[PDB]
Design an enzyme around this catalytic site. Structure first.
Site, short mmCIF file in Angstrom:
data_model
loop_
_atom_site.label_atom_id
_atom_site.label_comp_id
_atom_site.label_asym_id
_atom_site.label_seq_id
_atom_site.Cartn_x
_atom_site.Cartn_y
_atom_site.Cartn_z
N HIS A 1 63.10 131.44 74.82
CA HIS A 1 61.81 130.81 75.13
C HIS A 1 61.01 131.43 76.27
O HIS A 1 59.86 131.03 76.50
CB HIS A 1 61.99 129.31 75.38
CG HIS A 1 62.32 128.52 74.15
ND1 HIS A 1 62.81 127.24 74.19
CD2 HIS A 1 62.24 128.85 72.83
CE1 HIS A 1 63.01 126.80 72.96
NE2 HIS A 1 62.67 127.76 72.12
N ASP B 1 77.50 128.32 68.45
CA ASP B 1 78.32 128.54 67.26
C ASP B 1 79.63 129.28 67.59
O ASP B 1 79.74 129.91 68.64
CB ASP B 1 77.54 129.28 66.17
CG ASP B 1 77.80 128.73 64.77
OD1 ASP B 1 78.91 128.20 64.52
OD2 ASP B 1 76.89 128.82 63.92
N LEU C 1 71.65 130.68 68.97
CA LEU C 1 72.34 131.89 68.55
C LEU C 1 72.99 131.69 67.18
O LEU C 1 73.48 130.60 66.86
CB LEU C 1 73.38 132.31 69.60
CG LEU C 1 74.48 131.34 70.05
CD1 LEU C 1 75.76 131.56 69.25
CD2 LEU C 1 74.76 131.53 71.53
N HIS C 2 72.99 132.75 66.38
CA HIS C 2 73.59 132.71 65.05
C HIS C 2 74.11 134.08 64.62
O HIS C 2 73.41 135.09 64.75
CB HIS C 2 72.57 132.19 64.02
CG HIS C 2 73.19 131.47 62.87
ND1 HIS C 2 73.68 132.13 61.76
CD2 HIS C 2 73.42 130.16 62.65
CE1 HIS C 2 74.17 131.25 60.91
NE2 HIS C 2 74.03 130.04 61.43
#
Length: 314
Positions: free
Chosen positions: A287, A232, A273-274
């Site tokens: 993970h 992002d 990702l955010h």
């Protein structure tokens, strides 16, 4: 020239999330992730979870299944018209998920009548179109396949008028997807990650489901198993890309090419990702430990579609 590397503090948000991915914030500020690798009787039973940021406690929002076939939810975006999540699912395609656990399967077939492919990542432009990558083969009840070896991965656009249109195909496991907007807010470029080939591809957005001028946009470092996944933009249109298997998040400039910065992760496999709305805080799923982390970036994230106003005049 070497690529400059930063190693900021990563703080644990929550853990024990089988295949932790798809971080997203809703219109009320609630945090959501997906757990795609949850299994029942050796069969897909992926979950959409809400997490309290103070405690790290988990609430199972949705455990989606269509005709007995469980889902593998991967990527999430929040809508602005209603407090609902658009969820890309590897077994079920595109889903619209409500906070009460009810969900709707958007498309079994596309606009041309072709069978829908399983989706992984989605991204809204400011006009309301949802651009979606589909690395999987056909959706359930078809046998699960992924385009990691042969090029059958596709790109979709779910338009504002409710049309599921395949915009491109022949991708080798397409992953993360993001829209570069011009300063006036017009959708300009569609950035699409291709995982195993270690490349980012770009299109010029001409309108709803209209993409042209396909080219190589960026290069993902490393010869490790994996590559670019969730990604992002920040407020300056720097693209931050989770590089699965490299212990790094790559930072690209607006025009792409080689990464201008690398972010060292205390884990091998960042999945997505955010940004938290109106903050510099990036929530990163991974993970290696199947957990969620957070760290402070140098600036605020790019305004998310769910933050914008449908009836706003600016």
């Amino acid at each position: 020239m070497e690529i400059p590397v930063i190693e900021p503090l990563f703080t644990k948000v929550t853990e024990d999330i089988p295949g932790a991915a798809g971080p997203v914030f809703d219109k009320n500020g609630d945090f959501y992730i997906v757990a795609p690798y949850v299994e029942v009787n050796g069969k897909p039973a992926g979950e959409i979870l809400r997490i309290d940021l103070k405690t790290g406690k988990k609430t199972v929002i949705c455990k989606p299944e269509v005709n007995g076939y469980g889902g593998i939810p991967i990527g999430c975006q929040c809508d602005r018209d209603a407090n609902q999540l658009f969820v890309a699912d590897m077994r079920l395609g595109l889903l619209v998920v409500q906070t009460d656990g009810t969900f709707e399967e958007i498309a079994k077939k596309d606009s041309e009548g072709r069978r829908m492919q399983g989706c992984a990542y989605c991204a809204f432009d400011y006009e309301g179109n949802l651009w979606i990558t589909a690395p999987a083969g056909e959706v359930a009840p078809a046998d699960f396949t992924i385009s990691l070896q042969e090029k059958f991965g596709s790109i979709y656009c779910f338009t504002t008028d409710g049309q599921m249109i395949q915009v491109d195909t022949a991708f080798q496991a397409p992953a993360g997807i993001a829209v570069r907007h011009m300063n006036d807010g017009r959708p300009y470029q569609l950035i699409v990650a291709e995982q195993p080939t270690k490349k980012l591809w770009s299109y010029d957005i001409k309108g709803p489901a209209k993409i042209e001028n396909k080219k190589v946009w960026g290069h993902i470092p490393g010869t490790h198993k994996g590559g670019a996944a969730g990604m992002d933009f920040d407020e300056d249109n720097n693209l931050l890309v989770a590089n699965w298997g490299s212990s790094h998040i790559e930072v690209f400039g607006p025009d792409g090419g080689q990464p201008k910065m690398r972010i060292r992760c205390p884990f091998e496999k960042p999945s997505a990702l955010h940004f938290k709305p109106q903050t510099k805080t990036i929530f990163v799923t991974e993970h290696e430990n199947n957990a969620v982390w957070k760290f402070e970036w140098q600036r605020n994230g790019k305004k998310q579609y769910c933050e914008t106003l449908k009836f706003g005049i600016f």
